[PDB]
UniProtKB/Swiss-Prot annotation, chains A, B:
Disruption phenotype: Induction of the PhoP/PhoQ two-component regulatory system, suppressed by 50 uM CuSO(4). This is Thiol:disulfide interchange protein DsbA. It comes from the Bacteria. One of its GO terms (biological process) is cellular response to antibiotic. Residues 1-131 form the Thioredoxin domain. PANTHER family: THIOL:DISULFIDE INTERCHANGE PROTEIN DSBA (PTHR35891:SF2). CDD domains: DsbA_DsbA. Belongs to the thioredoxin family. DsbA subfamily. It comes from Escherichia coli (strain K12). The keyword Amino-acid biosynthesis does not apply.
Length: 188, 188
C-alpha cells in the first residue's frame, strides 16, 4: 500500500519476543548517529508521536571504537542507571566527534563530573553489578536482532526502519516521515 | 620538527596533476570541521606560515547531509564567486549545526541576504555558469583524490595530512605542528 515492506521498513525473518516496543541502537563514534541526535533530533520527534504508554529504549553498541567503544557502552549503562542520559548525550557526542577530547575512560568520567555527577557516585555506579547487568542487557539485545550496523531502530521486535527509502532534501520532512513510520508500525 | 611519511602525513599512490597548491575539503555538516574553523582557526594558522605565492583552496563536499549537502556545495560556490567566504562561513556552520535554522535550500539564501547580499544578486549567481562550473570543479577534485571523509587537506596534489599522527595533548602545539607540516610539504 503506502507503507511497503522493503521500502520504509523491513521485517525480521526471526522476530524477537519480549523486545522493548521501540528499540534504538547507536554509538558515539557513529557519524550518522551524531546527525540523527544532534541535528535531526530523531529520538525526540519519534517520542512526541508515539501512543500513550509505549516506552522507548536506546542502547549503545560495542562494535565501533574498539577499546573506547566498550568503555562507552559501560558509561551509557551508568547514564541509564543514574537517569542522566539527557545530561551527558550531547557532551559525549561532541567529546568524541567534535572536539575529539575523549580518548580514555578517564575522559568519559570527566564529562559526567562536569555535568554534575559526583565522582564517588560515578565510581560506585561504574563498578556496580547493576551496571554490569545493564551492559549484558545491551549486548543481549544487539545479539537478538543480529545487529551489524548503527544507527538502527526496531519496532515491537519485528520491524526495522529503513531510512534509505525517504527524501532528505528537507530535514524537517525527513524527520516527520521517519516519525510517522514508527507510529504506523507500532500500531501494526 | 621531524616529519615522516605514515606519521604526520601520507603520500598518494596516484598523484593529482593540476591540483591546487593547498587544497582543503570540508562540509557544513561536519562537526570537527566546525571546530577546526571557529575554535582552532586551522586555516588561518596555515596561511600565516605559507611561503610567498602560495594560495589556499577550500572546497565543500556532497557526501554529508543527504540532498541538502548538494545545495550547500552550490551555496559555497556562490560564496566563492561573490568573494564573501569570510562573511558567510561561520553563519552557515551555526545555521546547520548550532541554531539549526537551515533545514532546506531556502534557508541558505536568507543567510546571504542577512550578510548584505541582494536577493536578486544571489539568485542570479546561483544560476550562473561560473557557479555551475565551480560546483563541477569541487566534485571532480574530491573524485580525483578519492576522498573518503572530511576534514581533509592535500598538498601539491601529492601529500595528505594525517592529524592522527600529530601531537594532540596540547592544542596550541597541535595547531602549529599542523601548520608546519603544511609548510614543510609545500617545499617539496
Amino acid at each position: 500500500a503506502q507503507y511497503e515492506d522493503g521500502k520504509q521498513y523491513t521485517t525480521l525473518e526471526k522476530p524477537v519476543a519480549g523486545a522493548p516496543q521501540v528499540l534504538e541502537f547507536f554509538s558515539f563514534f557513529c557519524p550518522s548517529c551524531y546527525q540523527f541526535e544532534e541535528v535531526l533530533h530523531i529520538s525526540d520527534n519519534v517520542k512526541k508521536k508515539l501512543p500513550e504508554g509505549v516506552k522507548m529504549t536506546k542502547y549503545h553498541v560495542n562494535f565501533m571504537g574498539g577499546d573506547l567503544g566498550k568503555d562507552l557502552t559501560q558509561a551509557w549503562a551508568v547514564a541509564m542507571a543514574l537517569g542522566v542520559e539527557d545530561k551527558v548525550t550531547v557532551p559525549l557526542f561532541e567529546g568524541v566527534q567534535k572536539t575529539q577530547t575523549i580518548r580514555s575512560a578517564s575522559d568519559i568520567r570527566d564529562v559526567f563530573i562536569n555535568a554534575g555527577i559526583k565522582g564517588e557516585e560515578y565510581d560506585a555506579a561504574w563498578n556496580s553489578f547493576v551496571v554490569k547487568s545493564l551492559v549484558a542487557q545491551q549486548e543481549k539485545a544487539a545479539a537478538d536482532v543480529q545487529l551489524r550496523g548503527v544507527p538502527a531502530m526496531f519496532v515491537n521486535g519485528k520491524y526495522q526502519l529503513n531510512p534509505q527509502g525517504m527524501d532528505t532534501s528537507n530535514m524537517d520532512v525527513f524527520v516527520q516521515q521517519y516519525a510517522d513510520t514508527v507510529k504506523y508500525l507500532s500500531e501494526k
